[PDB]
Amino acid sequence: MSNISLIVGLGNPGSEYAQTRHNAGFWFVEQLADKYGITLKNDPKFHGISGRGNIEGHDVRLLLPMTYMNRSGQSVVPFSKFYQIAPEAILIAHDELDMNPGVIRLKTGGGHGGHNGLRDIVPHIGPNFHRLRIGIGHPGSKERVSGHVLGKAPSNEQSLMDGAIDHALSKVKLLVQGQVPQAMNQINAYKPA
C-alpha cells in the first residue's frame, strides 16, 4: 500500500463555524498538526491553510481548505496536483452524519455519501482516496440536517467525538507508514471507554 502523505481536514472558515459539527475534519487535522509541531500557515495560492513536517518519520503535508465546505475541491484538487500526490496517498477527514458521536471509521474509495465537501472532490481526483469518517450523529429528519451540521454539539456528544478523534490520532503512525489495513482494523474497532 501507499503511505499517506497528505492529510486534509474539511470544514468552514471563521470563528462562527470553528466549533460546529461540520468542522470535525478541521478538529482532527488541527490537533494532529499541534501534536507533531507542524505549523499550519495561510496558503492563498491553494485557497487553504497548509503545513508540512515530520510525522513518525515521514514527511506529510496537512491541508485545511478555506474555500467553504462545498467548494473544498478548489483547494484539495490543485494542491494535490501541484505536489503530484496521488489520491491513494491522501486521507480526508470529515464529519459523517450516518454515524453517531464516538463512532469513527477509516474507508477507502466509494462516493461522497451525500457529504457536500466530498461531492466537490470525488469528481476531479476520483474516489480512491482514504477517508476518516468522524461520526457526528443524525438529527432525525432531512429538514434539520443543515442546522445540525452547522451547529455546535452539546458537551456529552462533543466528548464522544473528541474521544474518537484522539483514538484516530494514535493510529496516524500506521497510516503514514503505509499500514492502511492495520490502521483500518484498529481505527474501526474503537468504542467509547
Side-chain angles (χ1 to χ4, degrees):
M1 225 124 182
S2 201
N3 287 5
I4 290 319
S5 73
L6 165 57
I7 297 175
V8 178
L10 297 190
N12 281 305
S15 77
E16 69 279 29
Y17 293 111
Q19 304 176 45
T20 64
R21 311 181 168 82
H22 209 33
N23 276 37
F26 273 28
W27 308 336
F28 172 85
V29 171
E30 285 192 307
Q31 286 172 39
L32 178 61
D34 206 51
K35 176 180 168 85
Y36 293 91
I38 291 168
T39 296
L40 297 181
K41 302 179 194 151
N42 297 327
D43 192 354
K45 188 176 165 35
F46 303 106
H47 310 292
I49 284 176
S50 66
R52 176 197 176 189
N54 179 311
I55 295 182
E56 303 290 348
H58 299 264
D59 207 65
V60 178
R61 294 175 190 277
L62 307 179
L63 176 72
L64 306 182
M66 287 294 128
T67 52
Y68 286 87
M69 174 71 86
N70 298 353
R71 301 167 177 182
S72 292
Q74 296 182 29
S75 172
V76 173
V77 174
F79 187 99
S80 63
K81 296 195 173 163
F82 182 79
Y83 290 112
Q84 291 202 319
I85 296 169
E88 291 81 359
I90 302 178
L91 172 66
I92 304 193
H94 67 91
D95 55 307
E96 177 53 73
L97 269 170
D98 288 345
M99 291 164 195
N100 282 333
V103 180
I104 189 162
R105 293 265 186 299
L106 179 75
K107 186 183 179 185
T108 303
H112 44 64
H115 187 284
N116 288 316
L118 292 180
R119 182 189 308 272
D120 203 58
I121 298 161
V122 177
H124 306 288
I125 65 170
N128 296 314
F129 58 89
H130 311 278
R131 300 95 187 278
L132 182 73
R133 311 171 66 188
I134 305 165
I136 51 157
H138 186 115
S141 97
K142 272 121 274 132
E143 105 228 335
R144 28 200 179 177
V145 161
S146 172
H148 179 69
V149 321
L150 296 173
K152 184 184 165 177
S155 75
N156 56 317
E157 283 175 12
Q158 187 66 240
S159 297
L160 296 167
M161 294 181 292
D162 297 349
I165 290 166
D166 287 349
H167 182 81
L169 288 171
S170 82
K171 307 300 171 169
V172 168
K173 169 188 205 333
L174 294 169
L175 294 168
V176 301
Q177 303 199 333
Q179 221 83 250
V180 173
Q182 294 69 10
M184 189 172 286
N185 297 345
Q186 286 179 47
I187 286 160
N188 296 358
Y190 180 77
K191 288 160 134 185

